[PDB]
Design a protein around this ligand. Sequence first.
Ligand SMILES: Nc1ncnc2c1ncn2[C@@H]1O[C@H](COP(=O)(O)OP(=O)(O)OP(O)(O)=S)[C@@H](O)[C@H]1O
Ligand SMILES: Nc1ncnc2c1ncn2[C@@H]1O[C@H](COP(=O)(O)OP(=O)(O)OP(O)(O)=S)[C@@H](O)[C@H]1O
Ligand SMILES: Nc1ncnc2c1ncn2[C@@H]1O[C@H](COP(=O)(O)OP(=O)(O)O)[C@@H](O)[C@H]1O
Ligand SMILES: [Mg+2]
Ligand SMILES: [Mg+2]
Lengths: 471, 470, 41, 578, 193, 193
Amino acid sequence: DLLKKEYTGITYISGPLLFVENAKDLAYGAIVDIKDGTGRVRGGQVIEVSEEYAVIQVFEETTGLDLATTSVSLVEDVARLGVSKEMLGRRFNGIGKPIDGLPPITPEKRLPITGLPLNPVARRKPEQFIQTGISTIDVMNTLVRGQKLPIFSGSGLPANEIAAQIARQATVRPDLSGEGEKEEPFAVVFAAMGITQRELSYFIQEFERTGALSRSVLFLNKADDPTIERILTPRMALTVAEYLAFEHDYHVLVILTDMTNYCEALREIGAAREEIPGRRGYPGYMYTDLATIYERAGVVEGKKGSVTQIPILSMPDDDRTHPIPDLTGYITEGQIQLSRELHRKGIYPPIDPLPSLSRLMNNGVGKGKTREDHKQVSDQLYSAYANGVDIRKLVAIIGEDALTENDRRYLQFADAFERFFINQGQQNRSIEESLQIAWALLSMLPQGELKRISKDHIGKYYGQKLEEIWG
Amino acid sequence: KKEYTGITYISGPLLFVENAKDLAYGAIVDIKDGTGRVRGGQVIEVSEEYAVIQVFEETTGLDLATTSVSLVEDVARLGVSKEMLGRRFNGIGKPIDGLPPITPEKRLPITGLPLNPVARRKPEQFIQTGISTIDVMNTLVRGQKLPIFSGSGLPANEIAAQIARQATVRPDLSGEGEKEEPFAVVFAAMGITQRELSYFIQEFERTGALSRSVLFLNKADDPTIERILTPRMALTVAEYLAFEHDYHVLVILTDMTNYCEALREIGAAREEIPGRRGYPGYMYTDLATIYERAGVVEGKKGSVTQIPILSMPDDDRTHPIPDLTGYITEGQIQLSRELHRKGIYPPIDPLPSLSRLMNNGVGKGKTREDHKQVSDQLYSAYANGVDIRKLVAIIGEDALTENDRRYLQFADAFERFFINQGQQNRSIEESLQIAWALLSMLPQGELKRISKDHIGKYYGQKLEEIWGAP
Amino acid sequence: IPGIRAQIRFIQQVLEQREREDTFRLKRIKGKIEAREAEEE
Amino acid sequence: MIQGVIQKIAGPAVIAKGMLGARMYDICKVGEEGLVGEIIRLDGDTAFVQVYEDTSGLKVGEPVVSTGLPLAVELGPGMLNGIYDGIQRPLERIREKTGIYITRGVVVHALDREKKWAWTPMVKPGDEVRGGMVLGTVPEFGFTHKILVPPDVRGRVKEVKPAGEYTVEEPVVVLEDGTELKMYHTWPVRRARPVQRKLDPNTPFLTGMRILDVLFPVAMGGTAAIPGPFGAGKSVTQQSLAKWSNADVVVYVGCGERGNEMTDVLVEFPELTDPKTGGPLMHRTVLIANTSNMPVAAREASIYVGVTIAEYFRDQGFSVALMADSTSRWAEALREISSRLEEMPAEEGYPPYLAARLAAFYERAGKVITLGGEEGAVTIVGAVSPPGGDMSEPVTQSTLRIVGAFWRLDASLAFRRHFPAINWNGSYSLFTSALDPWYRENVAEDYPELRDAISELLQREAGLQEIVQLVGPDALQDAERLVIEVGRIIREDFLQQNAYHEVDAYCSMKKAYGIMKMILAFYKEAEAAIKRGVSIDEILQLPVLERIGRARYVSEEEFPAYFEEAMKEIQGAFKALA
Amino acid sequence: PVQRKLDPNTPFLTGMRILDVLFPVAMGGTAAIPGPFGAGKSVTQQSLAKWSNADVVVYVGCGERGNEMTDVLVEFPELTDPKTGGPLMHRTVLIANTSNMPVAAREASIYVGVTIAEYFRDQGFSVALMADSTSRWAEALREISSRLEEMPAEEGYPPYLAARLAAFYERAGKVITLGGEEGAVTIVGAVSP
Amino acid sequence: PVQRKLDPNTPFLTGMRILDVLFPVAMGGTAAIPGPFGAGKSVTQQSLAKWSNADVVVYVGCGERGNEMTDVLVEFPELTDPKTGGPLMHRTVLIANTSNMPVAAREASIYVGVTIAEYFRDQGFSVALMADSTSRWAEALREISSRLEEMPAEEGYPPYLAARLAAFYERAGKVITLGGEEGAVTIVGAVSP
Ligand SMILES: Nc1ncnc2c1ncn2[C@@H]1O[C@H](COP(=O)(O)OP(=O)(O)OP(O)(O)=S)[C@@H](O)[C@H]1O
Ligand SMILES: Nc1ncnc2c1ncn2[C@@H]1O[C@H](COP(=O)(O)OP(=O)(O)OP(O)(O)=S)[C@@H](O)[C@H]1O
Ligand SMILES: Nc1ncnc2c1ncn2[C@@H]1O[C@H](COP(=O)(O)OP(=O)(O)O)[C@@H](O)[C@H]1O
Ligand SMILES: [Mg+2]
Ligand SMILES: [Mg+2]
């Protein structure tokens, strides 16, 4: 256990891979230490082992390695991370080593970083509504506790600002749910993969201003850090998140800052191994690999805690059909998609609701949870906005003056929707504020055209004007 | 019988047997295992070291210790006879109708020899399919390859069955009166489901059309090598009947898209690098070796006529399968989804359809003196009716000229009565009468493609064949 | 119409390029199958 | 037994050496933990094993033992209420044995060996029995579970246990020559269970959705596919079918999908009621759960286990619905295994035999005369998840060629929140003609004509949309604009169906017939009024349009009165308003 | 080999006013013709074979349909030669390949035909060479390239398709033969996109 | 190495109205200017070199025309440094690897330029680094990868292309140097899609 064994006789070094022979007693998936002639020790993992030779992916760069002096020594048979409640105020790199200057964590447990799949029988149904303060999320794409709700972004779009705002404003509403009790705030696990200095500084400063660093675990892999550490980074972050949530009753919010970089590292490793790729050269096991990360969120029966994931990915050319967003949407419960057209209009947050989706929205809204009209109001808003968009496309042909008055009303509803319901800035809107804004918007349309709303809700809420809400 | 023990490799559909230098390439072998079960297989590669055998069925249960391989025949051969009429086969010539195996008059290699181009002759006589949109406008000529271009949900199987049980020759129109000229239908089904299999069996048995038909029915879960061999068996039987017993043979091949997919999969299994669009680079040649076996031969009274049926994958005619089929065959009959969803059967659209050999098999002494001109006038008038139907939606009914309204009425009645045949069996005279009744809706002298003689002889009748007097 | 035609030809070129890349990868893996079978025997 | 050692480990793939005599597709125990794997290649003295569990931590040299048998499922009483993994392991027992996480190497019987069953024999000594014959009956949840002879067992009954309580391991019937028949038997999941003959698809499979049960029906023994991009509503449609179908038994296979959906089924279903039995809905449902983060090699096993269980329940005379929640995940698993095998792909990475495997899976459906003489059916509805929504993908194209119904979803309607979001233009069904006699006998004699008229209206609307997108809807004449308006009325209050509304979630055939009759009566009257000079904008203001729109929210019990009132209102409104 | 290639300064007279006047081809030039279905391509080809000032006509059927090849093989032996009254086939060489004949023959058909044309040119004759479909020949070339596992260039065609077409068409020309006598080969190649 | 990375709070004044007004870049920031040929990437780079407020300008001619490097070498000595008033060339360091120079040296030239810029940053200067085209560096990486028989990721580029680009662009930024002074590197990298 604690005696050292070293394998010399490296036979091949190229890119991220390393071949060592006569290593038949290295376990598959084992973590190894690569020592060079200068005494520096690198990290590595066994990705294929046979009685001839073992294949090791090197986490750091391979500069300075040589077949005559390099030595590979086993660290542990299974990649494990030492976890404790002590690391709630700590910062770590992509491989879990401290970078904040404090001494290393004294672990209570050492857990496998790949985790284990949750038994579907042991899961709960995620039902507790989370108020993010953003109307296009609260009303139309409701986020519930224990959901995987990624943000589909672009190169210039402000997904980081939206994630920071959600982390700042997210709260449950026990008074609406009938629990009526004080609630502890979210613990935040922030996994950054290939993050630039600008985004990192923004996130650090936001968490400092909001005072959430003292309850936030940070795994930071910089853009100039080695890219193979990005494979370990989200698994370690989610190991910490699962430990906290399901063994200390923490409600954990997990932010994975860029899954596109994770998929880039995965593609690099797969191509080095000549894996049979899927579309656009990404490995065929990318769906399973992303699933082993996303499916670690949720709520478990008999447990107080929860894990909520908000991954962030940038669709390369705003292409929703790209393999990364496609597989992510196939795995997660819906997505929040940003619109470049809304961003260019100056609307923040630039969330367009039509391509967005929340699959667990039905679980958390309705009577006794938020309000009786939530679902029908959301459906009516979607229908009216789609009508407005179609009428915009029609205007692009026949011109505005050739419209009827009802199409004109839908066009006015569409642009008022964009400029008032979506465009909200940094203000924190309660669900009641968002609902009254939505009803004021719906009051622009004829009463009989709210076909998706029951007459009771229409009688109770229809009539208010936007200028009555704010001067 | 020599048994080749020494299996050294099993993976997917392939197995390697050593010391098999005596196995000829392409031979069919029997694979026996510890349980005594026998599977079929084909030698796809033979060398000094080992022979590569592609197993027909799944390789489950095989092991390198107890598996044995033995030869059954060095060349894929089919035993053909005239008693094949009224029988059903599973795509490799094994009966599946419960009747005893036929006594083979002779055994023929299913990889048929190519017809000598100087031995062929021009197709000159037609086949009466009983369908007006084919008989009148896209006439099928004895010796033609006239594919049907179908879609995902279109009733191509129903049309295939109807043609199979309605197609006949008309020697009385040529003046021969020779009913002694036999007619047979060879029906090859590839990659069909149990539903389609039951439908085809019921259709062939209920009308008695089975007695002049040979069925090679390959199911969707049958081995893909059987799918590849099925059209070879069907065309071997067709060639035998036509050029050794003077039969007039109609061969219906459904579905060629399934055959192309099976060819793609088998090429991938043999580690061949695919060509254009992911299909094998030799798909053109394979489809040619299938299609070009139809024809009429100088000095022989028989004929082979082919009606391939293929579903365009995304209703795309640029797809490799319909594209190469158009390269090889003489025209196409295109089914229409908009006609189908309007309730018209058969949903054959005359405008994109085309029979390239039609003008050789119609006219005086073959069908009737007015056939070609009637077809041309019908085509032009229907095109005018369709575009006026599009225009009337914006400009309104009354804004059109009177003859434009007449074209509207003609197009509506054409779709109602000519195309919408139903399960009727219409002789070419009935179809021509219906066409003339429809053309009588247009004013005399508007029929510009038709000579004045035919107009005087046939113009004037009104629509009574279908409504008022069926 | 010209814009749609240009878009069609652009999409066709992209699809053909992806097919060419797939064929190149298939050639590489077939060569590696043959080589790794040949030397190992 | 064949014993060897591990030679190479690479992900889910383990190569063993010393496995001479091992057979293809036999189950092996890999490592000292005895992980379940399957042999997919034999090469010299080696065997290629795809492990159905996680291989992390395995070392070269660990033993590999072949069991000499392919993957098999235990078929007997005890499956009608449980949830299983890919290789038929009960997840309740696994949870009780391991906790909130699924650990590899857990061995547990598929059927509870201690549960007692009320046995009632149907045979006497001296009787000769063939495969598939009913030895006796056992009650499970109001179902009369029939104990069947294994399909390839023949003999004469020598001794039969009298009526009483026994476990599934008890040999209730002992044949001559000493062969013992228990309450359960094992069957290889890759072998189709034999039948006497396949029957024609006479009766329909009532899904409870108006668009699927009217425009694109599937027969009781047919096959359907529902492909669409993510968010289109594949799983909601699958769960609606599982809740509202007229099938006796529902087998739901979550092949490579979200675990939260399996949890949703596990929580909601016990509270819902079976429409025909009256008991809890979960009592007629069998779940085979293989979530996306569970081992990849087990997805194929999951599909085969589900279809084999469906076949077994069919052999008892039941009408079984099999919902495979994704076959694209099975295809991706095959591609991953092929990549580990270093085999040349066919198209987009998938192995050449993918189409053959899909065809074999889909051909197991059908209405059949079982070996016991009784009549049962299996209906397979398979979801497809094309990458990027590209319907030209090989899995979707391979599925097009073997299914009788095709329910195509489009993201355009899902974005609009128009549900079920079936693309009418891209969908079809090959069962419309064969089901017409049943519709005439059971719904209305004029139902096929009414459905054809609705389809023709939708076709006309589709044709006119080409001009609407060109010059706008106001450039049309009154008749064509009326067709457009009637088309959108159809789409909004006949094709839409709220799967969460307490009334709209289900719709009987007669309610859909009434809605169609109302819509077409309105259309005929509106066209007649158009011909007499009434404006279309005047027609669109009739409150009877509001009645038509609200028709779908009317309960089944009170619908006939609403329908008669609305027909009277249609006639009166278009008599008074000319 | 030839002694010298001459200038395209004398005309190849097809006997058709539109081609001879508006779109002429020099003696030894090359022309391409698309083949729409009903556009009467066969009649034009027969007119070139029958009325042009070429002494010998070489007709190459590369990959034609069975019935389309049968049309030619049946109807050329009926054409009478205006210059002699006798059959036109008495100064015609026919190369006929159908789609089901081996791909190597279909690929070598144009080379065989043009080599025969060059041989008759070396005797001082003027030869008109007609390639009935170079698209079918290109399909055969693509199939052979695929069988050799070569890289597909554009639309699956081998990257040397243009080189092969140029090598085929450059064989045409009016030359001084090695015997010191003037001869020419004029190529009219049909394309079917 | 540096002591600390600072937030960029001062603008990189390029002298071009559209860039300095509508799309400003900060002193430690990074900017990409992709465009087709003839769009004016190099003109913008040279305008930045002539007119920007950087203490030192490092211009990297990665795989582009030699005439542009000659133009810089000839014109810059005559121009005036906008900050100090001396000759503009004393402010400038040129790393030139023209298109017909060895391809493998493009990758080396990029790193040499960025390292020299970082060295001048360490002395307390603000440095503008102009990369004439990173697409040529990517093409050099593709060629070397093809020689290595590595499996290409997308359009033939190696899968680690994004990693190299990220590591190159991450070297820019406003920092407190190890000596305690404040320096910055601004990178403007042209792309040639
Ligand atoms: N110059 C012409 N003079 C008279 N009739 C012509 C002429 N060109 C074509 N035709 C007519 O066209 C028919 C014969 O040529 P076509 O069949 O049209 O040739 P083709 O079908 O285009 O040949 P392909 O494309 O290789 S199948 C006969 O009806 C001729 O009368
Ligand atoms: N700002 C400008 N003011 C004046 N002329 C300009 C300007 N930008 C570009 N041009 C002109 O356009 C030409 C193109 O120059 P560049 O923009 O440097 O070309 P490029 O972007 O480097 O693309 P290439 O040719 O592939 S290097 C210049 O030579 C000038 O003639
Ligand atoms: N028939 C329906 N009725 C109401 N809402 C639906 C319906 N189908 C889908 N939805 C909504 O759309 C979301 C996406 O559907 P879902 O089935 O989860 O996606 P997928 O197509 O991948 O299975 C659901 O979570 C639900 O909110
Ligand atoms: Mg789903
Ligand atoms: Mg430049």
